[PDB]
Design a protein around this ligand. Structure first.
Ligand code: HEM
Ligand SMILES: [Ca+2]
Ligand SMILES: [Ca+2]
Length: 336
């Protein structure tokens, strides 16, 4: 054990510098430890930075990518040019300063900012945090980020290559529980992906399984599908992953328990944090991460909609018991 200059107790001396970052982020980046756009933007960044890792590319005789090496910040000039990394310039430049200023690696900062950002949203699990990733990285190979226009096979092959199973792909997507879209359908900027974009819960999995009956904007975006109610946006890849035979059962079990969903996500996020790295070579500083406020609310089927409105895609397994909320049907306001 060690006590930092600030008095904080921690499991290792290199966990001490992190208490100053945590202080910085919460105060400025997060405008007061808040669960808004910054946290959602950072979640896109952590996924997009880590996923630039392909053992298959390497085998083919090409640079496969450095995984969670912070190249998205280190080589933003190249990476932010990728169509998948739109609307991230400011989050990146914001993170770059914090990183330099505090002298921490970009790969560690992104991973740290993620665990910290998650704590600002009610119901989030306490994501593990390891420190010690090299500060040096190369730009990520293009075309390594799965898109909403991609097929389930495309997405699973890409994610499988990176090291994730179909079930883990579903688990990582629990992140869409705190999300919205700004560039898929600009007409309805920031339309939430679920009824609670500020609460880490199972609503995302539940609501994506409801029958698509609503077009929230003047038109149906390129990679957009009908949603269950006004204000909610449904991404084509999410709609397909929820119903595909290869992933439907995992998606289905992720609707009943907030704790289980949280467990699986944390296990998945911990997997993604060390892509291109050796766990043994990193120092655990998980104790620097604050706990998120509890989510006592239980899973429910929104606005007078019943379980019979759910398009059950894994009938081989019993559909979980979930409370049903009375109407009227909701109309989501844009994500804060
Ligand atoms: C596996 C296939 C995935 C696809 C196809 C996908 C796609 C997308 C897209 C196209 C948007 C809309 C961005 C915009 O127009 O603002 C979005 C939002 C978001 N995504 Fe994903 N995603 C995937 C996985 C993940 C993962 C694994 C994480 C992190 C663990 C993540 C976190 C987020 C968050 C928090 C937003 C919200 C951003 C905001 O409100 O500005 N996604 N995603
Ligand atoms: Ca990277
Ligand atoms: Ca939610």
């Amino acid at each position: 054990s060690v006590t930092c200059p600030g008095g904080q107790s921690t499991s290792n001396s290199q966990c001490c510098v992190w208490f100053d970052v945590l202080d910085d982020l919460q105060t400025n980046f997060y405008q007061g430890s808040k669960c808004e756009s910054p946290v959602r933007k950072i979640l896109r960044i952590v996924f997009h930075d880590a996923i630039g890792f392909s053992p298959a590319l390497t085998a083919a005789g090409q640079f496969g990518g450095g995984g969670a090496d912070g190249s998205i910040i280190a080589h933003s000039n190249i990476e932010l040019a990728f169509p998948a990394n739109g609307g991230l310039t400011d989050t990146v430049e914001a993170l770059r300063a914090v990183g330099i200023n505090h002298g921490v690696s970009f790969g560690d900062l992104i991973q740290f900012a993620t665990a910290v950002g998650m704590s600002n949203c009610p119901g989030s699990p306490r994501l593990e945090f390891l420190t010690g990733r090299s500060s040096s990285s190369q730009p990520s190979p293009p075309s390594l980020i799965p898109g909403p226009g991609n097929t389930v096979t495309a997405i699973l092959d890409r994610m499988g290559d990176a090291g994730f199973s179909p079930d883990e792909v579903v688990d990582l997507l629990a992140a869409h529980s705190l999300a919205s879209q700004e560039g898929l359908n600009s007409a309805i900027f920031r339309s939430p992906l679920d009824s609670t974009p500020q609460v880490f819960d199972t609503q995302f999995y539940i609501e994506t399984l409801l029958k698509g009956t609503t077009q929230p904007g003047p038109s149906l975006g390129f990679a957009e599908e009908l949603s269950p109610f006004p204000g909610e946006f449904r991404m084509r890849s999410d709609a397909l992953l929820a119903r595909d035979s290869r992933t439907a059962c995992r998606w289905q079990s992720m609707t009943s328990s907030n704790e289980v969903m949280g467990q699986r996500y944390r296990a998945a996020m911990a997997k993604m944090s060390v892509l291109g790295f050796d766990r043994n070579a990193l120092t655990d500083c998980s104790d620097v991460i604050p706990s998120a406020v509890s989510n006592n609310a239980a899973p429910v089927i929104p606005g007078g909609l019943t379980v019979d409105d759910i398009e059950v895609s894994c009938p081989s397994e019993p559909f979980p018991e979930i409370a049903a909320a009375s109407g009227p049907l909701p109309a989501l306001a844009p994500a804060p």
